[PDB]
Amino acid sequence: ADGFTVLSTKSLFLGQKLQVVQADIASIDSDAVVHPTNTDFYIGGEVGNTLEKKGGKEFVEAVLELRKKNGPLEVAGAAVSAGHGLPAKFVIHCNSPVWGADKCEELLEKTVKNCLALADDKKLKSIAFPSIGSGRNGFPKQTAAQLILKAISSYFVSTMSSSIKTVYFVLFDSESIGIYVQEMA
Binding site feature residues for a glycoprotein: 24-25, 47, 96, 133-135, 137
Binding mask 140-169 for ligand APR (x = CB under 6 A): -x----------------------------
- Nearest residue relative to ligand APR (C-beta): 135
Stretch that binds ligand APR, among 34-42, 68-76, 83-91, 160-168 (CB under 6 A): 34-42
Contact call for residue 76 and ligand APR (CB under 6 A): no
Query: Residue 34 carries which side chain, given as an amino acid letter?
Result: V
Contact call for residue 25 and ligand APR (CB under 6 A): yes
HEC string of the chain equals CCCEEEEEEEECCCCCEEEEEEECHHHCCCCEEEEEECCCCCCCCHHHHHHHHHHHHHHHHHHHHHHHHHCCCCCCCEEEEECCCCCCCEEEEEECCCCCCCCHHHHHHHHHHHHHHHHHHCCCCEEEEECCCCCCCCCCHHHHHHHHHHHHHHHHCCCCCCCCCEEEEEECCHHHHHHHHHHCC
Contact call for residue 46 and ligand APR (CB under 6 A): yes
- CA dist 163 and 166 (Å) reads 9
Contact call for residue 44 and ligand APR (CB under 6 A): yes
Question: Among 12, 24, 79, 80, which residue interacts with ligand APR (rule: CB under 6 A)?
Answer: 24
Pairing of β 17-23 and β 90-95: unpaired
Closer of 122 and 136 to ligand APR (Cβ): 136
Sites for ligand APR among residues 90-129 (CB under 6 A)? 96
Contact call for residue 83 and ligand APR (CB under 6 A): no
Nearest approach in angstroms of CB 165 to ligand APR is: 21
Query: Residue 25 carries which side chain, given as an amino acid letter?
Result: I
Q: Which residues bind ligand APR (CB under 6 A)?
A: 24-26, 36-38, 42, 44-48, 50, 96, 130-137, 141, 170, 172-173, 176
